[PDB]
Design a protein around this ligand. Structure first.
Ligand SMILES: CCCCCCCCCCS[C@@H]1O[C@H](CO)[C@@H](O[C@H]2O[C@H](CO)[C@@H](O)[C@H](O)[C@H]2O)[C@H](O)[C@H]1O
Lengths: 103, 27
């Protein structure tokens, strides 16, 4: 099923649920952690220092049912900052598992 | 259908816009 209108509405619902999590999820155990965030594509929880953070492929994607173990990744440095680059800024993110294509 | 195939591209463009930072920056 192809609908721009339906996909935008699913994104808005994902965004609304994400905002609810960002506001209401309890703080981490420790004071060292990378901070939760909505990057417009995926919802990120607080990260554990020195760790990869994996979240499910966003379920608004028209092809989400094709990738239902796929993850998107970030890396939380040692440190409590999201791994970036920066050349330039924006955290490193791997979303290859959530891509539409075969091949 | 040309129109449905074009709507499918529009949607892929919308997803690309999100990956590029959406309402925050976006392209
Ligand atoms: C420079 C290269 C170094 C790479 C280091 C390798 C470790 C990084 C892994 C990223 S976080 C890791 O991802 C997993 C999701 O892919 C996550 O596992 C999940 O999915 C699994 C898929 O095998 C599934 O079998 C498990 O039931 C499920 O727990 C895992 O929790 C997470 O730590």
């Amino acid at each position: 099923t192809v609908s721009l209108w339906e996909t935008v509405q699913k994104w808005r619902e994902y965004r609304r649920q994400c905002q609810r999590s960002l506001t209401e999820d309890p703080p981490p155990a420790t004071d060292l952690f990378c901070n939760r965030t909505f990057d417009e594509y995926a919802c990120w929880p607080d990260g554990e220092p020195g760790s990869f953070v994996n979240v499910s492929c966003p379920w608004y994607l028209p092809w989400a049912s094709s990738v239902p173990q796929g993850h998107v990744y970030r890396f939380c440095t040692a440190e409590g900052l999201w791994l970036q680059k920066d050349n330039s800024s924006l955290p490193w993110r791997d979303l290859s598992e959530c891509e539409e294509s075969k091949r | 259908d040309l129109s449905k195939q074009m709507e499918e591209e529009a949607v892929r463009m919308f997803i690309e816009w999100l990956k590029n930072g959406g309402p925050s920056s976006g392209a």
